[PDB]
UniProtKB/Swiss-Prot annotation, chain E:
It comes from the Eukaryota. The gene is PSMA1. Induction: Induced in breast cancer tissue (at protein level). Up-regulated in liver tumor tissues. Glycans are attached at S110. This is Proteasome subunit alpha type-1. Disulfide bonds: none annotated. CDD domains: proteasome_alpha_type_1. Belongs to the peptidase T1A family. GO terms for molecular function: lipopolysaccharide binding.
Curated annotation (Swiss-Prot), chain G:
Pfam families: Proteasome. This is Proteasome subunit beta type-1. Glycans are attached at S30, S181. The modification Phosphoserine is found at S34, S40, S134. Its main location: cytoplasm. It is found in: Cytoplasm; Nucleus. The modification Phosphotyrosine is found at Y122. PROSITE patterns: PROTEASOME_BETA_1, PROTEASOME_BETA_2. The 26S proteasome consists of a 20S proteasome core and two 19S regulatory subunits. The 20S proteasome core is a barrel-shaped complex made of 28 subunits that are arranged in four stacked rings. The two outer rings are each formed by seven alpha subunits, and the two inner rings are formed by seven beta subunits. The proteolytic activity is exerted by three beta-subunits PSMB5, PSMB6 and PSMB7. Interacts with SERPINB2. Interacts with RFPL4A. Keywords: Acetylation, Cytoplasm, Deafness, Glycoprotein, Host-virus interaction, Intellectual disability, Nucleus, Phosphoprotein, Proteasome. One of its GO terms (biological process) is proteolysis involved in protein catabolic process. Belongs to the peptidase T1B family.
UniProtKB/Swiss-Prot annotation, chain H:
It holds the Pfam family Proteasome. It comes from Homo sapiens. GO terms for cellular component: cytoplasm; cytosol; extracellular exosome; nucleoplasm; nucleus; proteasome complex; proteasome core complex; proteasome core complex, beta-subunit complex. Non-catalytic component of the 20S core proteasome complex involved in the proteolytic degradation of most intracellular proteins. This complex plays numerous essential roles within the cell by associating with different regulatory particles. Associated with two 19S regulatory particles, forms the 26S proteasome and thus participates in the ATP-dependent degradation of ubiquitinated proteins. The 26S proteasome consists of a 20S proteasome core and two 19S regulatory subunits. The 20S proteasome core is a barrel-shaped complex made of 28 subunits that are arranged in four stacked rings. The two outer rings are each formed by seven alpha subunits, and the two inner rings are formed by seven beta subunits. The proteolytic activity is exerted by three beta-subunits PSMB5, PSMB6 and PSMB7. (Microbial infection) Interacts with HIV-1 TAT protein. This is Proteasome subunit beta type-3.
UniProtKB/Swiss-Prot annotation, chain I:
The gene is PSMB6. The lineage of its organism: Eukaryota, Metazoa, Chordata, Craniata, Vertebrata. GO terms for molecular function: cadherin binding; endopeptidase activity; threonine-type endopeptidase activity. It catalyses: Cleavage of peptide bonds with very broad specificity. This is Proteasome subunit beta type-6. Its EC number is 3.4.25.1.
């Protein structure tokens, strides 16, 4: 449905993002992912109303790149988050309905990575890990228990694996598993799923 | 010293000036014959490091009306955008064909906006410095109109406008006939176009187009132009 | 009403039905529920009769400007994107409109699914309708990228027939198209009642 | 420059790719003739050289001038002591 | 001197209190084509000359169908005339929508006048330099009016615009009594003759330039164009 | 918009020599007789007559715009032009616009008059439906009275037998007896071909057996 | 508050030839159980062999009609050239698509003759939309009359053995027969029947009266 | 629950002699789901002046930034310091504009003026009316209870060390009142020679 | 109306005589048993010849009254001499109509000019402008209707009219309402404007109650 999980290792960030591609009331295709890569330093995931997500995402991409070229500099991802939050804060008040939840996953060049969670009441927070949607219920107990501050790289991959097996086990939804992304300072890679 | 003035003669100043600007541009030629309209132009060239391949000055407004323009070339770029849209709007509204003439009127309304006075609603301080030869084919057959920078339209079957116009029009008379072959014409056009030139006759400074009912608006290609040269 | 589209070896097969209206049983068809955007592109009516008629025609004018000014063909991807924005304006004024815009461009065969929220997702099999679910079972069995043209026309054809029992605002006749790189060719219209 | 930088981005969103060079040029040109033809404005009067590539390896040099026109050249030189 | 001063003020007043702008406007009417207006007051005719700039052209119209009971001839530049004509057609349209009445052409003419006059009475507006002979078949018969770009509205039983207007006027006064309240045929002959007076008269009569337009008791707006005038010649 | 002080029952007909109109004189505020003996009669020009029913406040408002129409132009503004067919159309447009704002009026009006050779009797409503018919009645009168009037006015030779006033007089008595949200007094006005005439304050006449059977007081 | 919707519509029938058309209508106009007027058609002659009818409410019907007529006049002024049927067909729709906010509506039909020497009839929905017809009944009584009308006039259903081609005369007999029958099945049909017969000579009107009870 | 309650929160300030104290909660969850036990809702503007805000978190962030804009520019133009009083007013004017809209916030001001050497506290209401506080100040949803405790626990003379015990226990009592599990609290102890900040140890679930 | 509503009896009339008009009205406004407003005037000079009786809701009426005064003040200085008739009536109407249904005013405007004599106009809630022979207003009218029907007096004396209004109003307040206190009156003549005041204990035991005025 709508679900997004994240974990920040001290060397990369793995995120689980939603998939669809023919979803009405049936499953026949799932391949498309409601995420846009904000650049190559920041990546953004989102869930909410389906039309509003694309409309919101594109405006924010357009602006961030202008500032990059104009300054000839790059903003910190933290800097970006308050900016995004400020725009969404207006909207809520207005007649137009952007009230979507966003996850800004960012890597800081000489400050290390940072993970931001945005709510539909507009609230920006940093967490070493959090999650949202239906996914979150199952995942967060594992994350609390198995994770210990500054765990290895190798350990994360195993931990993410456990989630898929829980989701399978307990049984929820009707489409299978998640799409996982890796965000690093070597750019963005992909963690294949069964 | 207003340019919002009517003038003591009562013949507005600005319109007269435009004709002079036009005498400075190239030569553009039109003969409409019994069946088909031909428009021929000089797009010129000057240096060898230039690409006039890029350049043009004869445009198709649509696939059944075209126009050749002459004068302060930047203005004509504005002029066409308005026209082209307006034609297209009539297709949304009735999905039907517009007359060459209806299109020409619409653009002439827009010719009067100069000034900030109260005879014209302001947007511009001055008019478009260009004349256009508006061609088309419809049920009233192939026709040609001369759009006069004086914001008015006159109908024509043969016309030259350009620096050379005074001579050209004289030359145009002997060769014109109420009935003459389309292909024959193209050769006749070529002769006047040759006469005006000082620079070489090549297919890289002159451009032909015609409209015929059997094949729509067609721009004539290089290979085709080279063949026309061979005949005369 | 069920209309469906699927991608395969070369091109797209676009199929829909139509029928005369009165709120009762008939077999004569009326008009089209496919909109000819351009001689290249097809767009399906899967929203309100008027909404489609007006809005598709408008998108179509923009294509004719764009082609004339820039001197090129328009991209099917571009055309979806242009439609979506406009669809988004109309949001918060009710109304329905959904379509599938199908194309075979230089950049590929492309089907974009468009709805009435202004969500726009690109795909390769879509069935939209009420009957879409039923049609889908039939499509799915036959689904391959290794399918030949004759057979595809039948795949679709049978798929519609199944829809006729299920919904009474399906049936009457099915119109079929195969889209090539010099325009669409109609496979023609086949009466539902036959076999 | 600014007008161009937003404009590329307007296009980047719609066309989903970057456009041709010529197209960028046409916009800037349009404002300049627009400022002459309209009341109560005048153009900057600057001339530029516009150059780039697109997906193709064809190289592009287009020339812009404040006579409100644009054109292609193989080579070009502009400014003091041009001859 | 001060010719430029008097152009620069559209609020002009001189020691003799003249307004030059009007003067300029009058010279512009005389620059136009030749047109006559005639009425019996049960039929009205206008012979109008439509001319062509050169050999390979064909004549431009100066008879405008404003309505299916009212009409004009223009004498002066084509471009301004188009603008005025839209306003008057729309004024006829609302009369039809709201009131469903034709409306006196007399009443109409007077209204148009004001809206022009008031911008001469302030900054902006150059003269429009077209004069008109306005005809129409109303409730009390046909009526004829001369509208000027001086907004000088006058009803006349016949009038003329074009260089050497006076010539034809004098003939109209002479033949005036012969016009009476009959014969279609007669009015046109006198017009053809009269029109000859307006021209330099070195130019011989031609069927391609002339154009004849009638409105009358059971008539509405009809134009005889080119060759079509030969039957009635 | 919403009723305040209201009037009901305006009856009218066309006849050979004219049109005849009759209306009671009442301003009720639900059932309290705020005004007794109040006009409803607007002469329009001198050759056309408007009888109005509905809200009385709204009526006053309309009278003035009508008033402006003839105090303007070189000649009188309802003189040479403005025929009753025109005056009818002009009125209909005015309802139409209000209804389009959905900030409506609340009257039903009869425009009656003579043209120049032909009787003019035309209807306008809050709905805004416009018609000409030889017989009209408003309000309560529209339901009850109008079939009694219709027997006479759907048979065209029988119309021709008499000047109508008597049918009108008779109907109005039946109307007063059955309804007591109506008042005993009425005014009757006749627009003839060249002239206009108002008969002032009448009260219903006392019938023979009908008076025994049914009275008009509560 | 006050209504933003009132019914008033009648019933009409449009029959398409292949060089003629007839559009026939009752004069009876009613709403519910009280009778608005015992007269007036909703079919009108627009002119030039275009016949039009707007069923839905009288207030809307007059207004559209008047308004169209100016767009045609203006057009001819703008350069000599006239709207074809199809042109008119698009023009009505734009008006309706505007009116989708407006809360009153009508069900419009246009008929006339082409220069293909045959009839065209186009029919609109009360939101916009158009379709190509062969035959259309509009109004209240339409739904009941039409299958039978379709079969008797048509013979294009999957439930008839043969075809016959139309005749004018034959079309006239069928039309009267349908209306006389309609009347004792509605209180929206009755009184009189106004027939607009469309030919290439010009427009003719015929009237016949019907029953009432 | 309310338009201020989705993440709850309470804030206390108590005055001492020659010192003042401001204590607050921290916690941010999303509705009733606790994600983190942190979120400052008190900010200071200059060392000694403290401002505690208690709306919805969303609102709080926006309001704190507004007060920064105004104050900085004001400070610049007059070219000399702002007073505590001046901050109070400013808040009122801002409070008045938000009254039509759904941004409702309760501020509390605390600080001890050290260019005048007097203690200063105030509370302000979410309809914009300023009410100058004395000796104790309350804010949060728990207020009715909180008020009860503040009337009881206080004693007229206080030393920072006594003041510390008073707030701590107040804070301890206060966290049991939350249904939103607002666990974690900070104390700032202010003197016109020193500030102490203390995070306190408390229940954990 | 804005935020009141009156649910008690009101009783006002202006009665015409030869010399002019005499106005009477009750004092005090009430909403319920609790006293909304104590003994007060609504017999208002907005001119020296022109007075009004205010009824309905207090806030609305007060606002209307000053607004007319402004207009008539400008009008008086330049045209000179104001008559009541067309001229006062319309200015009050327009407002009642415009402000429409957020307006509760029942006004009897009564005036005396030597220009056409005294006049009486009555603003109902619709804002109809009616010339009346004499008028009774308020909700308490319902109590007085019967008295006036019974008595059938005619012929006016300043003294005769004073008794007439005194019994009618007195009774009206007695049966229902919670309005009472003082009844105040103005007889307006060429002499000037004479003010009468009658205490609530001096105002019972009257009779007489004209209906034909001649």
């Amino acid at each position: 449905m709508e679900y997004l999980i994240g974990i920040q290792g001290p060397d990369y960030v793995l995120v689980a993002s939603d998939r669809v591609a023919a979803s009405n009331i049936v499953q026949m295709k799932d391949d498309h992912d409601k995420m846009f890569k904000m650049s190559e330093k920041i990546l953004l995931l989102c869930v909410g109303e389906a039309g509003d997500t694309v409309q919101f995402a594109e405006y924010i991409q357009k602006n961030v790149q202008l500032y990059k070229m104009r300054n000839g500099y790059e903003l910190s991802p933290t800097a970006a988050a308050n900016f995004t939050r400020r725009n969404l804060a207006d909207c809520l008040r207005s007649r137009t309905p952007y009230h979507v939840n966003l996850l800004l996953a960012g890597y800081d060049e000489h400050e290390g990575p940072a993970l931001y969670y945005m709510d539909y009441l507009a609230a920006l927070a940093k967490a070493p890990f959090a999650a949202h949607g239906y996914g979150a219920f199952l995942t967060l107990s594992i994350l609390d228990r198995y994770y210990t501050p500054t765990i290895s790289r190798e350990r994360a991959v195993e931990l993410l694996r456990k989630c898929l097996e829980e989701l399978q086990k307990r049984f929820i939804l009707n489409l299978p598993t998640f799409s996982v992304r890796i965000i690093d300072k070597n750019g963005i890679h992909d963690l294949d799923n069964i | 010293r207003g340019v919002n003035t009517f003038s003591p003669e009562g013949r507005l100043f600005q319109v007269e000036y435009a004709i002079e600007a036009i005498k400075l541009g190239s030569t553009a030629i039109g003969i409409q014959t019994s069946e088909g309209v031909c428009l021929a132009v000089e797009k010129r060239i000057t240096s060898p490091l230039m690409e006039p391949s890029s350049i043009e000055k004869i445009v198709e407004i649509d696939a059944h009306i075209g126009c050749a323009m002459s004068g302060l070339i930047a203005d004509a770029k504005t002029l066409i955008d308005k026209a082209r849209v307006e034609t297209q709007n009539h297709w949304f509204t009735y999905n039907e064909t517009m007359t060459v003439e209806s299109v020409t009127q619409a653009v002439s309304n827009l010719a009067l906006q100069f000034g900030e006075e109260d005879a014209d609603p302001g947007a511009m301080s001055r008019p478009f410095g260009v004349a256009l030869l508006f061609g088309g084919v419809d049920e009233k057959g192939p026709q040609l109109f001369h759009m006069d920078p004086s914001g008015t339209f006159v109908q024509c079957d043969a016309r030259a406008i350009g620096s050379a116009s005074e001579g050209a029009q004289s030359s145009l008379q002997e060769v014109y006939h109420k009935s003459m072959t389309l292909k024959e014409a193209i050769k006749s056009s070529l002769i006047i176009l040759k006469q005006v030139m000082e620079e070489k006759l090549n297919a890289t400074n002159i451009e032909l187009a015609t409209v015929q009912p059997g094949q729509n608006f067609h721009m004539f290609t290089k290979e085709e132009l080279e063949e026309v040269i061979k005949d005369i | 009403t069920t209309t469906l589209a699927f991608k395969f070896r070369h091109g797209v097969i676009v199929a829909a039905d139509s029928r005369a209206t009165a709120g009762a049983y008939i077999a004569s068809q009326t008009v089209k529920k496919v909109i000819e955007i351009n001689p290249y592109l097809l767009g399906t009516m899967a929203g309100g009769a008027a909404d489609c008629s007006f809005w598709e025609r408008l998108l179509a004018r923009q294509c004719r400007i764009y082609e004339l000014r820039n001197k090129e063909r328009i991209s099917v991807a571009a055309a979806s994107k242009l439609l979506a924005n406009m669809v988004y304006q109309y949001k918060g004024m009710g109304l329905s409109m959904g379509t599938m815009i199908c194309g075979w461009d230089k950049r590929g065969p492309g089907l974009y699914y468009v709805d009435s929220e202004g969500n726009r997702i690109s795909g390769a099999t879509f069935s939209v309708g009420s009957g879409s679910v039923y049609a889908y079972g039939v499509m799915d069995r036959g689904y391959s990228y290794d399918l030949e043209v004759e057979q595809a026309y039948d795949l679709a054809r049978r798929a519609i027939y199944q829809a006729t029992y299920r919904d009474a605002y399906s049936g009457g006749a099915v119109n079929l198209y195969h889209v090539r790189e010099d325009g669409w060719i109609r496979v023609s219209s086949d009466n539902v009642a036959d076999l | 420059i600014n007008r161009a930088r937003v404009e590329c981005q307007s296009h980047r969103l719609t066309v989903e790719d970057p456009v041709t060079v010529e197209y960028i040029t046409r916009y800037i040109a349009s404002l300049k003739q627009r400022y002459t033809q309209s009341n109560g404005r005048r153009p900057f009067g600057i001339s530029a050289l516009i150059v780039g590539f697109d997906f193709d390896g064809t190289p592009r040099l287009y020339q812009t001038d404040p006579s409100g026109t644009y054109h292609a050249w193989k080579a070009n030189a502009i400014g003091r002591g041009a001859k | 001197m001060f010719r430029n001063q008097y152009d620069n003020d559209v609020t002009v007043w001189s020691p003799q209190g003249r307004i030059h702008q009007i003067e300029y406007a009058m010279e512009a009417v005389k620059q136009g084509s030749a047109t006559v207006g005639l009425k019996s007051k049960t039929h009205a005719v206008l012979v109008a000359l439509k001319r062509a700039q050169s050999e390979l052209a064909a004549h431009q119209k100066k008879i405008l169908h404003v309505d299916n009971h009212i009409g004009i001839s223009i004498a002066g530049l084509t471009a301004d005339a188009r603008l005025l004509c839209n306003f008057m057609r729309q004024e006829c349209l609302d009369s039809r929508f709201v009131f469903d009445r034709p409306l006196p052409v007399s009443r109409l003419v007077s209204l148009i006048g004001s809206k022009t006059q008031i911008p001469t009475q302030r900054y902006g507006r150059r003269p429009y330099g077209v004069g008109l002979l306005i005809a129409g078949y109303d409730d009390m018969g046909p009526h004829i009016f001369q509208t000027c770009p001086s907004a000088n509205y006058f009803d006349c039983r016949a009038m003329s615009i074009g260089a050497r207007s006076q010539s034809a006027r004098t003939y109209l006064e002479r033949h005036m009594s012969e016009f009476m309240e009959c014969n279609l045929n007669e009015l046109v002959k006198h017009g053809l003759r009269a029109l000859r007076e307006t021209l330099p008269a070195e130019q011989d009569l031609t069927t391609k330039n002339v154009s004849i337009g009638i409105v009358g008791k059971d008539l509405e707006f009809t134009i005889y164009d080119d060759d079509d005038v030969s039957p009635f010649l | 918009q919403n009723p305040m002080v209201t009037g009901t029952s305006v009856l009218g007909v066309k006849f050979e020599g004219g049109v005849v109109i009759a209306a009671d004189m009442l301003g009720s505020y639900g059932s309290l007789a705020r005004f007794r003996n109040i006009s409803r009669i607007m002469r329009v020009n001198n050759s056309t007559m408007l009888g109005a029913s509905g809200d009385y406040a709204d009526f006053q408002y309309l009278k003035q715009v009508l008033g402006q129409m003839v105090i303007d132009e070189e000649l009188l503004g309802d003189g040479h032009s403005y025929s009753p067919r025109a005056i009818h159309s002009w009125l209909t447009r005015a309802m139409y616009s209000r209804r389009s704002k959905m900030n409506p009026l609340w009257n039903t009006m009869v425009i009656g008059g003579y043209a120049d050779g032909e009787s003019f009797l035309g209807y306008v409503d809050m709905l805004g439906v416009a018609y000409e018919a030889p017989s009209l009645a408003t309000g309560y009168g529209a339901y009850l009275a109008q079939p009694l009037l219709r027997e006479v006015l759907e048979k065209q030779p029988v119309l021709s037998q008499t000047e109508a006033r008597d049918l009108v007089e008779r109907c109005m008595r039946v109307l007063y007896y059955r309804d007591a949200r109506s008042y005993n007094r009425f005014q009757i006005a006749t627009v003839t071909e060249k002239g206009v005439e108002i008969e002032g304050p009448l009260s219903t006449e006392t019938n023979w057996d009908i008076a025994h059977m049914i009275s008009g007081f509560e | 508050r006050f209504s933003p919707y009132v019914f008033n519509g009648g019933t009409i029938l449009a029959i398409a030839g292949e060089d003629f058309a007839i559009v026939a209508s009752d004069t009876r106009l009613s709403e519910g159980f009280s009778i608005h007027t015992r007269d007036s058609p909703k079919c009108y002659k627009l002119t030039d062999k275009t016949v039009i009818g707007c069923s839905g409410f009288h207030g809307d019907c007059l207004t559209l009609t008047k308004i169209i007529e100016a767009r045609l006049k203006m057009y001819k002024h703008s350069n000599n050239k006239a709207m074809t049927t199809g042109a008119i067909a698009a023009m009505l729709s734009t008006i309706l698509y505007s009116r989708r906010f407006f809360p009153y509506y009508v069900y419009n039909i246009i008929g006339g003759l082409d220069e293909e020497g045959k009839g065209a009839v186009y029919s609109f929905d009360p939101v916009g939309s158009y379709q190509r017809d062969s035959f259309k009944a509009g109004g209240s009584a339409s739904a009941m009359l039409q299958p039978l009308l379709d079969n008797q006039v048509g013979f294009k259903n999957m439930q008839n053995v043969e075809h016959v081609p139309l005749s004018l005369d034959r079309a006239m007999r069928l039309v009267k027969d349908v209306f006389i029958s309609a009347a004792e099945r509605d209180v929206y049909t009755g009184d009189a029947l106004r027939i607009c017969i469309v030919t290439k000579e010009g427009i003719r009107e015929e009237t016949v009266s019907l029953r009432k009870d | 629950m309310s338009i201020m309650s989705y993440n709850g929160g309470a804030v206390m300030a108590m005055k001492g002699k020659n010192c003042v104290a401001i204590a607050a909660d921290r916690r941010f969850g999303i509705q009733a789901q606790m994600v983190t036990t942190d979120f400052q809702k008190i900010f200071p503007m200059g060392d000694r002046l403290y401002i505690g805000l208690a709306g919805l978190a969303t609102d709080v962030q926006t309001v704190a930034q507004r007060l920064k804009f105004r104050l900085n520019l004001y400070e610049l133009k007059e070219g000399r310091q702002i007073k505590p009083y001046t901050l109070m007013s400013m808040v009122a004017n801002l409070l008045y504009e938000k009254r039509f809209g759904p941004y409702y916030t309760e501020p509390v001001i605390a600080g001890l003026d050290p260019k005048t050497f007097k203690p200063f506290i105030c509370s302000l209401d979410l309809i914009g009316c300023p009410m100058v506080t004395d000796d104790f100040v309350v804010s949060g949803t728990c207020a009715e209870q909180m008020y009860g405790m503040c009337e009881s626990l206080w004693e007229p003379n206080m030393d920072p060390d006594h003041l510390f015990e008073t707030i701590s226990q107040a804070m301890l009592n206060a966290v049991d009142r939350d249904a939103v599990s607002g666990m974690g609290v900070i104390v700032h102890i202010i003197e016109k020679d020193k500030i102490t900040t203390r995070t306190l140890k408390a229940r954990m679930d | 109306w804005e935020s009141r509503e009156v649910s008690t009896g009101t009783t006002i009339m202006a009665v015409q005589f030869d010399g002019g008009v005499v106005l009477g009205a009750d004092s005090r406004t009430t909403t319920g048993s609790y006293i909304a407003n104590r003994v007060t005037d609504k017999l208002t000079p907005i001119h020296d010849r022109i007075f009004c009786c205010r009824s309905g809701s207090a806030a609305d009426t007060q606002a209307v009254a000053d607004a007319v005064t402004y207009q008539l003040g400008f009008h008086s200085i330049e045209l000179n001499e104001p008559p009541l008739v067309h001229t006062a009536a319309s200015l009050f109407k327009e407002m009642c109509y415009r402000y429409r249904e957020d307006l509760m005013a029942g006004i009897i405007i009564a005036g005396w000019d030597p220009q056409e004599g005294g006049q009486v106009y009555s603003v109902p809630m619709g804002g109809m402008m009616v010339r009346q022979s004499f008028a009774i207003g308020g909700s308490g009218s319902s109590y007085i209707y019967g008295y006036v029907d019974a008595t059938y007096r005619e012929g006016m004396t300043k003294e005769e009219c004073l008794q007439f209004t005194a019994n009618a109003l007195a009774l009206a307040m007695e049966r229902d309402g919670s309005s009472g206190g003082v009844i105040r009156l103005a007889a307006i003549a060429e002499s000037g404007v004479e003010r009468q005041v009658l205490l609530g204990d001096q105002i019972p035991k009257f009779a007489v109650a004209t209906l034909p005025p001649a």
